[PDB]
Amino acid sequence: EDIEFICKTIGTKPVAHIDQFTADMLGSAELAEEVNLNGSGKLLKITGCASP
Amino acid sequence: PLSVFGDRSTGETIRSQNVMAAASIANIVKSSLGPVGLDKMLVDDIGDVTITNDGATILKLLEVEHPAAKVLCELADLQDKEVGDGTTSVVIIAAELLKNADELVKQKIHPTSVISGYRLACKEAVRYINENLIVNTDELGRDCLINAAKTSMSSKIIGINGDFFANMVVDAVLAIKYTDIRGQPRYPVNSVNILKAHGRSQMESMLISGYALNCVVGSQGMPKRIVNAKIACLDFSLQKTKMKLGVQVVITDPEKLDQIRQRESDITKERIQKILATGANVILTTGGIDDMCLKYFVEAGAMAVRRVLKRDLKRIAKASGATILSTLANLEGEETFEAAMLGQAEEVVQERICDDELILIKNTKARTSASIILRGANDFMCDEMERSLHDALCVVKRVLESKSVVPGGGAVEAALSIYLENYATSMGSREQLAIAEFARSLLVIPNTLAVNAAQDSTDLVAKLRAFHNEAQVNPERKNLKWIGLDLSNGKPRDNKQAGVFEPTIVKVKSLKFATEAAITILRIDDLIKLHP
Amino acid sequence: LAGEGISVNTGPKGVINDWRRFKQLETEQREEQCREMERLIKKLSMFLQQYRKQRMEEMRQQLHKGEGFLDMIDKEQKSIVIMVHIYEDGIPGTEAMNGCMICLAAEYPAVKFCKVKSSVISSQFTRNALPALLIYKGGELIGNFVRVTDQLGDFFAVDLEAFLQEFGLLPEKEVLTSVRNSATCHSEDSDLEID
Numbered sequence: 001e002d003i004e005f006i007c008k009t010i011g012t013k014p015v016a017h018i019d020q021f022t023a024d025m026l027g028s029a030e031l032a033e034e035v036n037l038n039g040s041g042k043l044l045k046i047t048g049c050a051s052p
Numbered sequence: 053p054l055s056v057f058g059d060r061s062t063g064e065t066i067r068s069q070n071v072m073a074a075a076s077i078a079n080i081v082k083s084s085l086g087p088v089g090l091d092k093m094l095v096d097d098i099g100d101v102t103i104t105n106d107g108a109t110i111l112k113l114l115e116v117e118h119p120a121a122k123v124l125c126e127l128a129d130l131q132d133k134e135v136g137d138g139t140t141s142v143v144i145i146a147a148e149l150l151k152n153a154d155e156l157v158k159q160k161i162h163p164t165s166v167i168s169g170y171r172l173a174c175k176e177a178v179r180y181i182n183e184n185l186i187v188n189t190d191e192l193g194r195d196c197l198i199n200a201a202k203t204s205m206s207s208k209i210i211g212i213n214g215d216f217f218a219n220m221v222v223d224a225v226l227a228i229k230y231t232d233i234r235g236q237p238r239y240p241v242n243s244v245n246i247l248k249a250h251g252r253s254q255m256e257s258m259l260i261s262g263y264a265l266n267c268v269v270g271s272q273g274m275p276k277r278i279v280n281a282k283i284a285c286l287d288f289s290l291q292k293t294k295m296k297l298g299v300q301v302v303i304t305d306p307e308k309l310d311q312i313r314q315r316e317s318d319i320t321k322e323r324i325q326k327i328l329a330t331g332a333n334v335i336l337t338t339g340g341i342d343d344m345c346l347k348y349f350v351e352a353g354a355m356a357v358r359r360v361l362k363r364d365l366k367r368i369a370k371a372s373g374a375t376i377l378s379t380l381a382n383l384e385g386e387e388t389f390e391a392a393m394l395g396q397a398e399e400v401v402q403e404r405i406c407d408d409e410l411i412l413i414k415n416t417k418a419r420t421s422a423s424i425i426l427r428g429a430n431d432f433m434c435d436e437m438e439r440s441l442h443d444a445l446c447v448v449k450r451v452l453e454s455k456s457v458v459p460g461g462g463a464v465e466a467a468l469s470i471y472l473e474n475y476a477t478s479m480g481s482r483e484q485l486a487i488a489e490f491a492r493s494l495l496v497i498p499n500t501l502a503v504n505a506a507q508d509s510t511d512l513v514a515k516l517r518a519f520h521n522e523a524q525v526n527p528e529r530k531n532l533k534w535i536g537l538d539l540s541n542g543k544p545r546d547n548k549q550a551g552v553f554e555p556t557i558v559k560v561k562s563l564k565f566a567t568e569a570a571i572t573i574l575r576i577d578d579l580i581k582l583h584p
Numbered sequence: 585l586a587g588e589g590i591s592v593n594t595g596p597k598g599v600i601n602d603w604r605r606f607k608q609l610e611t612e613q614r615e616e617q618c619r620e621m622e623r624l625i626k627k628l629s630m631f632l633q634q635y636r637k638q639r640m641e642e643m644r645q646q647l648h649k650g651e652g653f654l655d656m657i658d659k660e661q662k663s664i665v666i667m668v669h670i671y672e673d674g675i676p677g678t679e680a681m682n683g684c685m686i687c688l689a690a691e692y693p694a695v696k697f698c699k700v701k702s703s704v705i706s707s708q709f710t711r712n713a714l715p716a717l718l719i720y721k722g723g724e725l726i727g728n729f730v731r732v733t734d735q736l737g738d739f740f741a742v743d744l745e746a747f748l749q750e751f752g753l754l755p756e757k758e759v760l761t762s763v764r765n766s767a768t769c770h771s772e773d774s775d776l777e778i779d
């Protein structure tokens with residue numbers, strides 16, 4: 001259910017077969033990191049995207 | 053007329069009920085605050101016994117029905133998670149805040165004004181703590197860490213044992229120190245494996261200069277001591293090879309059955325030979341090892357341990373420099389194992405601890421790790437020692453991360469109460485009353501500390517307030533900010549001089565969490581309880 | 585006495601509160617009776633021979649090293665086996681199988697041996713049908729054993745273990761730690777170096 005949101009945000013295009021997995025279907029991002037919330041959990045954040 | 057299938061409470065009734073629930077939760081743990089506090093012994097109605105002083109443990113073990121009380125219980129849990137210390141103090145402060153706020157509301161003060169006053173008082177208290185009541189640890193040194201650990205371990209089963217346990221905790225914390233990017237020294241607690249075993253006295257607790265495993269060798273034929281260990285960490289089981297679901301063996305020529313059956317084990321034999329050909333001495337795997345590979349390792353005179361915990365294996369690999377190998381497959385499509393994947397340690401020994409044995413990995417190279425073996429009189433005392441040790445480790449981590457500490461023994465509470473009582477007169481007309489009640493509510497901690505010691509709480513708190521008022525009024529007597537409570541003799545005492553310290557983050561986070569909990573409970577004026 | 589066709593009105597709507605007040609208790613009673621009747625009436629109405637390993641199993645076994653009935657089975661995981669025990673004080677034969685279950689629990693921690701009297705939970709079940717080894721797995725009866733004294737006697741833990749294992753109901757059996765190791769489980773911030 002989150003594929004549409006992820007593709008709209010990052011700019012990636014889903015790949016269903018390795019034949020079509022090319023560079024132009026990737027979404028460039030400035031930073032992708034996992035941050036811990038002071039011991040209350042871990043959050044994966046992707047901040048900064050070309051053509052957001 | 054509502055025709056709602058349930059019960060409804062509205063007005064002063066529900067507010068009084070919520071305050072009653074919060075006060076009851078506070079009174080449950082109010083007797084276990086400060087060095088003169090005493091532990092509680094819980095029974096789980098199946099014979100299980102838990103003796104503890106930690107507020108979070110007590111509130112988690114108890115089953116609570118009222119939701120406003122569940123709010124305080126999960127508040128204590130949150131304080132334990134985000135700080136690790138001050139778990140009872142935050143609950144007590146939140147309950148006192150709720151009680152005084154309810155008194156204000158019953159005096160026909162609107163709850164919104166009380167909430168605004170509480171927010172202003174919390175913000176100004178945090179600002180005053182940050183600007184007036186902090187001591188840098190740079191000019192103190194290791195003595196500051198030792199004193200913080202000793203203060204944390206007071207009111208615990210390792211209180212008088214503090215002179216030794218503080219050194220142990222400080223060494224354990226400093227052993228696991230590492231610096232990440234931006235050059236920030238981050239201290240990763242919970243990487244110190246805490247192993248408990250009843251037996252000798254608490255003085256006999258050992259701090260391992262390495263890592264301690266709660267597991268033994270898989271076969272009695274293997275040696276129980278290897279000097280120059282070459283640890284090989286694996287994440288796959290070493291058993292007879294079995295084909296997956298998508299592969300099925302069908303035999304039409306009967307001559308191939310013996311070859312098939314032989315290869316089924318020769319695959320694992322070849323894997324073991326490849327692993328051992330690099331000089332590996334200790335082999336650790338998260339999966340199981342059957343008897344065949346155990347005999348392979350026996351003949352080579354090497355360690356082999358099965359069913360190792362994943363976190364223990366990761367810590368061992370990181371400390372010794374080994375690499376976890378979930379599979380044997382390089383980028384060439386082959387199946388090989390090289391010596392670059394081997395970790396090193398100065399000694400690996402299977403030691404005996406009170407009729408039971410455990411594996412000690414001593415002096416790992418390329419990284420220093422630590423573990424603590426706690427010796428006690430029975431299981432309950434070992435559990436309480438473990439909890440208190442975790443509290444002390446968290447306190448030391450907070451002190452080493454943020455280099456600011458605050459005086460203990462309720463000095464901060466008294467200073468905040470005096471400052472906020474003075475400050476309330478400069479803001480509003482009813483938020484003035486809210487801030488005054490916040491200041492009065494902050495006095496519950498020294499009152500409880502004095503009461504638990506069977507001392508004259510009124511006189512002691514009055515003297516403390518007089519000292520702090522003189523400090524705040526006179527600008528040439530600012531050294532009285534450190535005057536706290538000496539519960540051994542029941543007299544005011546300069547706690548900074550006496551070495552009673554707490555991390556500033558403990559006070560700040562406790563105040564913020566208590567303020568939010570009180571605000572959340574205070575917003576309710578009606579309750580609908582639907583029938584299940 | 586006419587005008588039976590009424591189709592009534594909001595009158596019953598005005599009494600939905602008491603209707604549901606009584607209906608919740610009635611439904612709870614119906615659930616309790618349904619869980620009771622799943623066994624009652626449904627089951628109440630209807631030299632290798634010397635076991636050379638019995639002695640070794642016995643000597644290794646001694647190496648020790650109303651609403652509740654509904655609530656303890658309604659909750660918790662369905663993947664574990666619960667062997668409910670039925671007994672009444674005074675009638676002989678309960679103590680032997682109670683001790684057998686106590687011994688079995690040592691070697692089978694997965695099983696959830698529990699005991700409950702008949703009084704708290706029928707007359708024909710109380711007079712001469714007290715000993716029942718109710719085995720619950722997945723919320724439904726897998727073992728409905730009654731009159732177990734005939735095939736057991738008046739028997740050690742080995743007999744009960746064999747009787748339960750011959751029907752494939754006992755989970756497969758699986759060291760002594762110092763006391764414990766674990767203290768928590770979360771993002772524990774494992775060791776790193778960074779250079």
Ligand SMILES: Nc1ncnc2c1ncn2[C@@H]1O[C@H](COP(=O)(O)OP(=O)(O)O)[C@@H](O)[C@H]1O
Pocket residue numbers: 084085086087105106107136137138139140141142203204206207460461462497501537538539552554
């Ligand atoms: N040696 C000491 N002298 C005076 N007060 C102390 C001393 N050690 C601790 N205290 C105070 O006792 C209070 C209770 O702390 P404690 O209840 O042990 O922490 P927690 O609330 O996490 O259980 C702390 O606020 C601390 O200021």
Ligand SMILES: [Mg+2]
Pocket residue numbers: 137138139204443
């Ligand atoms: Mg404490």
